[PDB]
Amino acid sequence: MDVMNRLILAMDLMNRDDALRVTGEVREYIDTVKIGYPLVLSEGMDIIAEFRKRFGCRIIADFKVADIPETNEKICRATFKAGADAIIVHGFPGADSVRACLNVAEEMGREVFLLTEMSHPGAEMFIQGAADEIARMGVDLGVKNYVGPSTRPERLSRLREIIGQDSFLISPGAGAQGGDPGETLRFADAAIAGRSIYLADNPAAAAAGIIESIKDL
Amino acid sequence: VMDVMNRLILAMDLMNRDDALRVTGEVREYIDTVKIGYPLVLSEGMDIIAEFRKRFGCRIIADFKVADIPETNEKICRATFKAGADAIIVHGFPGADSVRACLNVAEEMGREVFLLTEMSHPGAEMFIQGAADEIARMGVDLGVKNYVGPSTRPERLSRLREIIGQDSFLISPGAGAQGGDPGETLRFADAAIAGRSIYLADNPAAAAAGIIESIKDL
Ligand SMILES: O=C1CC(=O)N([C@@H]2O[C@H](COP(=O)(O)O)[C@@H](O)[C@H]2O)C(=O)N1
Ligand SMILES: O=C1CC(=O)N([C@@H]2O[C@H](COP(=O)(O)O)[C@@H](O)[C@H]2O)C(=O)N1
């Protein structure tokens, strides 16, 4: 996956007009957009097609899929029918639930991103202790795309070690949550940026600023 | 606690608007509480909640298994309650701050949060089961009053009930299609969730009636 400037936009605005405007303002810097439930539940799944039509960008559906196998398959099918190129799935619910997603992705020509450890403080309670094992599970299942925390570079580094250099790794947490884009890119292929861009007085300048800081990478 | 008719909640996971409406309408005389999840919402839109309210006036539990960071969880809950959902289901494994974010929005918006502790599928044994008791205890400490536990594991459902106490509200999926028994499930849960055993039956109404008949004494 060729992510322009190794920067993925987390478009979590909840208004179609604003989401489209801001995304358009940074289109010259980013060609990969992560769309989650904040926008989808506010504007509908048709927003994904609107983005591909307007920006011809790659779309990662960040739905943190975390249901039983049967329901997971339905969620993935509905998501890919909407035009998403990939979907993010939680690993905590187990191997069968992840496999269900992998099956639909293969069937519709899409990619599955396995979320191992999360970036927020609460991740330390239950997720962190199971993260390494979740990552190994991904390897065992043939998962090639992963999500790790920018807020804990040592943990992100460990995730990279487990999955190897061939696997693709994206990471949220830089900016608003305290992570550093440059440090994150020492281990992740691409850094995710939401508020640091869409909540900035000048989103375009914010995006340009982030890229300027990692220009040597 | 919500008064769930016949202690039976319909898991409406059909992905077709017409079929979902037909089936739900056919069993309305037996069920007044419907669980709507992403299979239907991602296929027909959040307005499906509005249509169910208008057509059936049934209570709506949005099964979105919210599992994001606090900031995003808050937005998901706000959008969901704005759409008309009476309650939303949230995962406890992401931690206390993520759950608290949902509780705060529910409190501010006058709605309810259901905390999913242990799940019913086989994969739940890998990571969730080992953290389930603590997740439940965390819920109690946070003031959570509504919970979700597995019908497929009576022993686990029983322990969950003990942890949350008799005053807490507990609903449980897994009976029927996944192998659980409605009767046994209701020994610990306030209401049992039923999806495929009802919506895939040739006669959903008869299926619902059959399930209720087997638990009439309860
Ligand atoms: O561990 C994780 C996973 C994840 O997807 N995310 C998402 O990544 C984005 C981060 O946005 P922000 O840059 O903090 O504003 C949001 O859409 C989150 O829901 C996260 O922050 N942490
Ligand atoms: O542990 C859990 C949680 C849950 O919500 N569910 C949901 O409960 C319903 C069960 O449906 P079914 O009766 O097996 O067809 C589905 O909507 C599932 O996504 C589950 O099966 N197990």
Q: Catalogue all structural domains in chain A, each as residue range(s) with its CATH number.
A: 1-217 (3.20.20.70)
Q: Which ligand is nearest to the CA of A174?
A: 1
CB B180 within 8 A of CB B159: no
Alpha carbons A170 and A175: distance in angstroms, whole number: 15
Q: How far is the CA of B174 from the centre of ligand 2 (A)?
A: 6
CB A213 within 8 A of CB A175: no
Could you give the residue numbers annotated as active site of A?
A: 64
Q: Which of A66, A125, A177 sits opposite B95 (nearest CB)?
A: A125
Q: Which residues pair with A146 in a beta bridge?
A: A114, A169
Q: For chain B, what is the HEC assignment?
A: CCCCHHHEEEEECCCCHHHHHHHHHHCCCCCCEEEEEHHHHHHHCCHHHHHHHHHHCCEEEEEEEECCCHHHHHHHHHHHHHCCCCEEEEECCCCHHHHHHHHHHHHHHCCEEEEECCCCCHHHHCCHHHHHHHHHHHHHHHCCCEEECCCCCHHHHHHHHHHHCCCCEEEECCECCCCECHHHHCCCCCEEEECHHHHCCCCHHHHHHHHHHCCCCC
Alpha carbons A190 and A171: distance in angstroms, whole number: 6
Alpha carbons A112 and A114: distance in angstroms, whole number: 6
**Shortest CA distance from B73: residue in chain A:** A38
Tally of CA atoms within 13 A in the half-sphere of A214 that contains its CB: 23
Q: Which chain B residues are Cβ-neighbours of A91 within 8 angstroms? A: 127
Q: How far is the CA of A43 from the centre of ligand 2 (A)?
A: 26
Tally of CA atoms within 13 A in the half-sphere of B9 that contains its CB: 28
How many inter-chain contacts (A to B, CB under 8 Å) are there?
A: 134
Q: Which ligand is nearest to the CA of A198?
A: 1
- Resolution in angstroms comes to 1.4
Experimental technique of record: X-ray
CA nearest to A170, candidates A4, A6, A28: A6
